[PDB]
C-alpha cells in the first residue's frame, strides 16, 4: 500500500523509537525490529537496522 496515513504513522513511530533507543522491555525492542522489518520490506531499503 505504502502511501497511506497508516504507513506514515508507522514510520513516525519507527523514527521516534530510533531517536531514544533506550528500550525498557522486550516488546519495545520487538516493536522496533518489527517496524524496521516492515519498513524494509515495504520500501525495499531504509536507513536503520535492527538492534
Amino acid at each position: 500500500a505504502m502511501t497511506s496515513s497508516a504507513d506514515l504513522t508507522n514510520l513516525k513511530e519507527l523514527l521516534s523509537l530510533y531517536k531514544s533507543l533506550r528500550f525498557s522491555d522486550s516488546a519495545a525492542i520487538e516493536k522496533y525490529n518489527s517496524l524496521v522489518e516492515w519498513g524494509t520490506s515495504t520500501y525495499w531499503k531504509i536507513g536503520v537496522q535492527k538492534v
Binding site: T3, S4, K12, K45, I46, G47
Partner: protein, 221 residues
C-alpha cells in the same frame, strides 16, 4: 573550469550537454541512443528532440529525492519532468494542491519540482509520440534503466507516481534503494488526494540521516 560537458551523437539532437555527475553513463547513452534515435525520430515527439536530454544538465551529488513519472506529458513536454510553465497540466496542479494542504501555503501562481533543493524530477522514458502515452517505451528501455540506475546511486529516496506504470520497478534496478510507488495524480477516486507520499519521503529521509525536502520551495508566486 565548467561543470558542463558535451558529447556528439549521430541523430538529432546531435549534441547532448551534461553535468559532470552524469559522466559515467555517457559512453553507453551515446552508444544506445545511436542505434534507436532513427526509429524514434520517425514520429513527432513530446518533448522535441532538442529537449530530450536537458535534465542531464542537473547535478546529482546534492540530490536526496527523485520524483519519477513514467514519461513526459503527451503534449507540451519541456524536457523538464512535470514542468508546465503556464501552470496548465493536471498532474502538476494536483501536486501543487497536495503541497498547499501539507504546508498551508494557500496563495500561489505556479509549482515546479525542478527548483526544489534536494529534488530531481525525472521521466522514466525520455519521449513519447505526440498525444500517445508510453508510445516510445520500447525504444527507451535500455537507456531508461541505465539512467535511473545512476540516479538511485545518489538519491536516498526514489518516489514513482503510477502504481500500474511502476509495479515492476525493483526489477529495473541493480542495488536496492528506498522506493515508494504512489498513485498517479489523475488516478480514479481522488486516490492521490489521500496519498501522503510527500510526508512519507521526509520521514524516510530523517531515518537515513538526511535532511527533509522543503516542498514549499516549489511554489511560484
Amino acid at each position: 573550469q565548467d561543470p558542463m560537458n558535451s558529447v556528439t551523437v549521430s541523430h538529432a539532437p546531435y549534441t547532448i550537454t551534461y553535468h559532470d555527475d552524469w559522466e559515467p553513463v555517457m559512453s553507453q547513452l551515446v552508444e544506445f541512443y545511436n542505434e534507436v534515435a532513427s526509429w524514434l525520430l520517425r514520429d513527432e515527439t513530446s518533448p522535441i528532440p532538442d529537449k530530450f536530454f536537458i535534465q542531464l544538465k542537473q547535478p546529482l551529488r546534492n540530490k536526496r529525492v527523485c520524483v519519477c513519472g513514467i514519461d513526459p506529458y503527451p503534449k507540451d513536454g519541456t524536457g523538464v519532468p512535470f514542468e508546465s510553465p503556464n501552470f496548465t497540466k493536471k498532474s502538476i496542479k494536483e501536486i501543487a494542491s497536495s503541497i498547499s494542504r501539507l504546508t498551508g501555503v494557500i496563495d500561489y501562481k505556479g509549482y515546479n519540482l525542478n527548483i526544489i533543493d534536494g529534488v530531481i524530477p525525472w521521466n522514466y522514458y525520455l519521449s513519447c509520440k505526440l498525444g500517445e502515452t508510453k508510445s516510445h517505451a520500447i525504444y527507451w528501455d535500455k537507456i531508461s534503466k541505465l539512467l535511473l540506475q545512476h540516479i538511485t546511486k545518489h538519491v536516498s529516496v526514489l518516489y514513482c507516481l503510477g502504481k500500474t506504470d511502476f509495479s515492476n520497478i525493483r526489477a529495473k534496478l541493480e542495488s536496492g534503494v528506498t522506493t515508494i510507488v504512489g498513485y498517479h495524480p489523475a488516478a480514479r477516486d481522488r486516490q492521490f488526494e489521500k496519498d501522503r507520499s510527500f510526508e512519507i519521503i521526509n520521514v524516510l529521509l530523517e531515518l537515513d540521516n538526511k535532511v527533509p525536502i522543503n516542498w514549499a520551495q516549489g511554489f511560484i508566486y
